[PDB]
Design a protein around this ligand. Structure first.
Ligand SMILES: [Mg+2]
Ligand SMILES: [Mg+2]
Ligand SMILES: [Mg+2]
Ligand SMILES: [Mg+2]
Ligand SMILES: [Mg+2]
Ligand SMILES: [Mg+2]
Ligand SMILES: [Mg+2]
Ligand SMILES: [Mg+2]
Ligand SMILES: [Mg+2]
Ligand SMILES: [Mg+2]
Ligand SMILES: [Mg+2]
Ligand SMILES: [Mg+2]
Ligand SMILES: [Mg+2]
Ligand SMILES: [Mg+2]
Ligand SMILES: [Mg+2]
Ligand SMILES: [Mg+2]
Ligand SMILES: [Mg+2]
Ligand SMILES: [Mg+2]
Ligand SMILES: [Mg+2]
Ligand SMILES: [Mg+2]
Ligand SMILES: [Mg+2]
Ligand SMILES: [Mg+2]
Ligand SMILES: [Mg+2]
Ligand SMILES: [Mg+2]
Ligand SMILES: [Mg+2]
Ligand SMILES: [Mg+2]
Ligand SMILES: [Mg+2]
Ligand SMILES: [Mg+2]
Lengths: 169, 200, 172, 98
RNA sequence: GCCCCUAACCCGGCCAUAGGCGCCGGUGCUACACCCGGUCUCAUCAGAACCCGGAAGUUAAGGCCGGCGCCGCGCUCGGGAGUACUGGGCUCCGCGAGGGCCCGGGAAACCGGCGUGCUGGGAGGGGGC
RNA sequence: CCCCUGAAAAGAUAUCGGGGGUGCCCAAAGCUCGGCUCAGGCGGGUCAGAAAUCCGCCGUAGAGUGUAAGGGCAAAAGCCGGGCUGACUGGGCCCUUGAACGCAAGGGGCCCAGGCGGGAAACCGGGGCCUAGAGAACGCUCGUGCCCCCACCAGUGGGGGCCGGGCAUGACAGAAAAGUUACCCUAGGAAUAACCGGCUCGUCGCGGGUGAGAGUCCCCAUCGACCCCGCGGUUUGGUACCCAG
RNA sequence: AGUACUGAUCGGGGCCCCGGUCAAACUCCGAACCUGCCAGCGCCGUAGAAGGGGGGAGGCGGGGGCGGUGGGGUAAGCCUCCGCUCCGAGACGGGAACAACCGAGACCGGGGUUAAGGCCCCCAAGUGCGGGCUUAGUGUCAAUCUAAAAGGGCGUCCCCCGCCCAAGACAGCCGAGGCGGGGGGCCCCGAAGAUGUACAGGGACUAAGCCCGCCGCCGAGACCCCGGCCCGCGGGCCGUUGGCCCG
């Protein structure tokens, strides 16, 4: 994988129609909603924290997965799976491309340089706008310090600056 | 009906009165249409010009008009169809209509049907209607000889069935076996009334 | 019937690098040189043109006394000759003030007579015959604020209101 | 790859209909009678595409010059070049604007 | 003949405000129907349909009219919102992708409210010329 | 050559841009008239079954329409049946190929005349529902005409001509055409590679944030998974700006 | 914009309903905007519009800025389209230098006034005016042009919120304010290179820096004026393969 700065900016149209894309990669995020997901038990939670994007850009699938792991592990350890609801709010629909010389990927991929430059699929990313919610947490007011810490850890894994907004439901 | 993508058909199509595929081919002629429609009890004949905002009926009549010439046969048989075309034909001619195109709507063009009897009456009044020579009913059927022959057979087989099946004929004072004689009388009165009108 | 307000329009920015659609409109408004000035009747078709050239000109409601001074100092007739009181009187206008007031108030709908206008005898024309339909001004004494910013945020471009008369007096 | 130029080569949007316009169109356009000098608007009907004029003439105003059987001979312009469009009334609308 | 007024019927235009589901009523001299038959014209496996000949029965159904409810749909109505977006100018900000200011335009979803066919010609009926 | 996208709501629009297709096939899959309604679901019905034929209800097209893609189509443009050959002879005009603006072949549309097919009629038929399946000159060959010409005249054989169909150039606006040079030569080119330089930094090297986990206990003595922010110009590449007297 | 057709996609509830994430090759809706005809305005046109004919070309390598996330690409002073303008073929002022950034379009001479930009010295014009901030020589008035991120800092200036104290609050009886959270400005750390100094013009400056405002002045070939010259077009006079005069 290239450094994430290579795919951070929105430089072209969304590339999502998988029926026209050969070898589009499979999404490598196993779950998107963590903790207590049933709507009845979520009624106990009365606070909402959001990790909100500050800039527009593309977040790679592995960064979303890395952010999801660190925050969910922290909440499981310190808050408890029965006392919170955490949702990864964006889905990596956009397919990333790379122009590299490769074997077993088509004859055109054997031409070097910028000849036949249209890249083969290299991964997935979510295209986000300023103010967009990346992570969404529902919790009880007693755990505010722990929820803020979990979202601070998630933010350290993401390629764009974010900010934490805490509001009641 | 169910959902926004449902397309409701044209009002006259969902009422089942207008075949828009056939109507379009009629309008391409740019000629007046002889509209002939059948009801249970009457026949309707209209001469219609189509206009973008709606059709214009130059002359329209149903078979109730036959009582104005002392008609005593049934309202909508083959004989009544011919007399209706004659009245419509002369009225249409007085308004400047020389040629028309037959429009039968959803009725079938079976040979000898009443729609072609109205056409035959319209033709004899001087309005030209293109047609094939194998669909006009025979003169015997136009004169009602098929009605008279049926009743004559009924009387000598079951005299009571003659009384029920033609009760209204007996009420009007014209027994069905005398229909061809009366049809000539009514036809003469209609023709004379309009040739004199045309002459004046 | 309707008498539209009379506006003075001054071209503030130059010819080279002016965008094409703005340059075309300025030419039709007779502002074909920098610091050229015209007076127009503010009909909706005219105001649509001024909006198009808003970033290249400054404009506002011109007053009759300012117009009287402009005519006396920068008014030119055919041959690039000065406009004089005697020339006005020959045509039936008593003074610069009277013709300027006639135009500002709406008594006449044009200041310079059209190209195809034909002068009659005895009748005072509803304009000044053979006046050039534009004025060539001096640069403003004391300068401007900025020819690249709009007057509404401290520059000089765009709608100026009655302050166009203060600017004109400095440009005479 | 260069643009291909079939007779209908960039006409997906133009020849598409909204759901509420699906099916046959009304017949009133058939019943207008145009005389020489009338102004018409070329409004392509996608249910009769074979008789429709080229996409470049959609929305143009023409003048009726005469008739040819059932079609109308229309004089119009593409930019600066005079073009003759011969088309049936289902692809025409009266121009009320003068 | 002519002009005016006017149900259900005939020929239309626009083609859901007209469609869909459910419930409650109205209409029958005439008109529309359901209806009665199959000798004749015509028709099929089938007189069911089509076609022909009728008038015993009925407003039960269709058609047309009125009301209520829900769905769907419509609206030059309120909010959403001068928001999103955008034509022109800028030695205005930002490391940058980008944003901002001024002049000129300006939505959509959605929420609420209102609406639920309108209309052209003809027959028939009424009034006069 | 053709469709969608790119393409920025008139028109035009490129890249060794993206997703596909074409060099056919069909005497019906062509013309016309009539009737009918599809995929799918439910209820009932002898074998019989998820699926055969039968009765009924629902069913906006979720089917079909030869063939790519897009578009169109429900008393039809689909399915079935009846009758047919217009996939016609002689011509004209227009649209597109080819934007405004010159310019092939090909394709499409509207008509006039001749003579037909279907149909009660209206009307429709000069192939396929629409947008692809397409070939100059010279030469040859066939069709056609009471046809024109062949050297002083007439005749016989033969030859030529005008009009139309075909035989082909796919590098498709049309030569008939294999290598090799490190033995090499000439004209030139920084319109164009190799070295260095310029730009870029994926790669390379170096730094930082994060802290799962390891470290007896203990995140940070020492480390640092999963990820993320950078710097350098030190490897390699990308590009082709300068330099081929 | 929507997720209603075709597709993608995360959850909840009972194949349906509700919420959520998306679409270059999806679209119920739908701008700004562009474009057709007519009428008007504006301007051009009898000193000749439209249209047409004839002779001669050059040229058929383009380039810069800005805008379409244009499309591609890690990116490129990169490749390939669309539009306005400029360089090529354009002098001159500013930008330290510099085709295309800003200003602006140059016949010749002179006077005047402005534009961009600047006014401590170099260098024409202010050691100009009020308020506030920075202590790092940070920085030193857009772009080409020589820079900086995630992250850390009550370093310092400031704004808002929650709670405690009704003098029995915070800190170890005393007597007045105190504790926590969120944000903003400037600066500090993060911040490492090769011939020669806090480089980005130099001197140097604690303002001669930065932020909110303000006043005057300097400053082009631009604009105004005077004189001289030339030109295009029209008119006139002269025995003219031409000359002269006027507008
Ligand atoms: Mg891009
Ligand atoms: Mg400029
Ligand atoms: Mg081309
Ligand atoms: Mg065809
Ligand atoms: Mg277009
Ligand atoms: Mg095909
Ligand atoms: Mg059919
Ligand atoms: Mg070509
Ligand atoms: Mg052209
Ligand atoms: Mg072709
Ligand atoms: Mg001889
Ligand atoms: Mg070629
Ligand atoms: Mg060297
Ligand atoms: Mg190199
Ligand atoms: Mg690396
Ligand atoms: Mg650490
Ligand atoms: Mg290198
Ligand atoms: Mg080069
Ligand atoms: Mg060099
Ligand atoms: Mg969206
Ligand atoms: Mg456009
Ligand atoms: Mg070239
Ligand atoms: Mg360019
Ligand atoms: Mg050159
Ligand atoms: Mg300089
Ligand atoms: Mg000095
Ligand atoms: Mg960066
Ligand atoms: Mg420094």
């Amino acid at each position: 994988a290239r450094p994430a700065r290579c795919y951070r900016r929105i430089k072209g149209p969304p590339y999502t129609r998988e029926e026209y894309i050969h070898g589009a990669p499979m999404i490598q995020i196993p779950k998107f909603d963590m903790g207590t997901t049933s709507a009845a038990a979520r009624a106990a939670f009365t606070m909402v924290a959001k990790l909100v994007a500050e800039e527009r850009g593309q977040i790679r699938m592995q960064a979303l997965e890395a952010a999801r792991q660190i925050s969910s592990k922290y909440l499981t350890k310190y808050v408890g799976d029965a006392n919170y609801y955490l949702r990864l709010n964006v889905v990596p629909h956009h397919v990333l491309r790379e122009n590299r010389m490769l074997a077993m990927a088509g004859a055109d991929r054997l031409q070097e340089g910028m000849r036949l430059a249209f890249g083969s699929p290299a991964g997935r990313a979510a295209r986000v706008e300023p103010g967009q919610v990346i992570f969404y947490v529902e919790f009880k007011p007693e755990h505010l310090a722990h929820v803020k810490e979990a979202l601070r850890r998630a933010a350290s894994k993401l390629p764009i600056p974010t900010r934490i907004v805490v509001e009641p439901k | 009906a169910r959902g926004a993508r449902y397309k409701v058909p044209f009002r006259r199509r969902r009422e089942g009165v207008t075949n828009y595929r056939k109507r379009r081919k009629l309008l391409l002629s740019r000629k007046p249409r002889l509209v002939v429609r059948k009801t249970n009890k009457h026949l309707i004949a209209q001469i219609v010009i189509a206009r973008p905002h709606g059709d214009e009926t130059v002359v329209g009549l149903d078979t109730r008009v036959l009582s104005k010439f002392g008609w005593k046969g049934d309202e909508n048989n083959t004989s009544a169809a011919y007399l209706l075309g004659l009245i419509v034909g002369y009225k249409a001619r007085a308004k400047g209509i020389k040629e028309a195109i037959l429009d039968i709507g959803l009725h079938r063009p079976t040979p000898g049907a009443r729609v072609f009897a109205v056409m035959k009456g319209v033709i004899d009044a001087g309005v030209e209607v293109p047609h094939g020579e194998e669909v006009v009913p025979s003169e015997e059927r136009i004169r009602g000889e098929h009605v008279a022959e049926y009743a004559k057979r009924l009387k000598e087989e079951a005299p009571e069935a003659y009384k029920a099946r033609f009760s209204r004929y007996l009420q009007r004072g014209l027994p069905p076996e005398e229909l061809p004689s009366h049809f000539e009388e009514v036809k003469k009165k209609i023709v004379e009334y309009y040739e004199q009108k045309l002459a004046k | 019937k309707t008498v539209y307000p009379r506006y003075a329009v001054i071209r503030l920015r130059g010819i080279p690098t002016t965008p094409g659609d703005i340059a075309a409109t300025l030419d039709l408004l007779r502002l074909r040189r920098k610091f050229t000035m015209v007076v127009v009747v503010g009909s909706p078709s005219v105001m649509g043109m001024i909006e198009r050239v808003n970033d290249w000109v400054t404009w506002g409601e011109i007053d009759a006394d300012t117009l009287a001074e402009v005519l006396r100092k920068r008014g030119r007739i055919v041959g690039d000759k000065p406009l004089t009181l005697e020339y006005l009187q020959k045509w039936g206008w008593n003074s610069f003030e009277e013709v300027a007031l006639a135009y500002i108030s709406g008594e006449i709908e044009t200041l310079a007579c059209k190209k195809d206008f034909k002068a009659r005898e005895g009748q005072r024309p509803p304009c000044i015959p053979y006046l050039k339909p534009f004025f060539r001004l001096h640069p403003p004494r004391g300068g401007l604020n900025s020819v690249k910013l709009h007057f509404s945020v401290g520059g000089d471009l765009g709608y100026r209101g009655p302050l166009i008369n203060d600017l004109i007096k400095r440009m005479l | 790859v260069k643009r291909t130029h079939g007779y209908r080569y960039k006409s997906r949007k133009l020849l598409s209909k909204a759901p509420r316009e699906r099916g046959m169109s009304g017949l009133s356009r058939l019943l207008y009678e145009y005389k020489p000098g009338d102004k018409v608007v070329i409004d392509i009907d996608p249910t009769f595409i074979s008789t429709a004029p080229h996409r470049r003439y959609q929305g143009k105003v023409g003048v009726v010059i005469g008739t040819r059987g059932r079609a109308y001979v229309i004089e119009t312009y593409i930019g600066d070049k005079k073009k003759i469009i011969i088309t049936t009334p289902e692809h025409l609308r009266p121009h009320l604007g003068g």
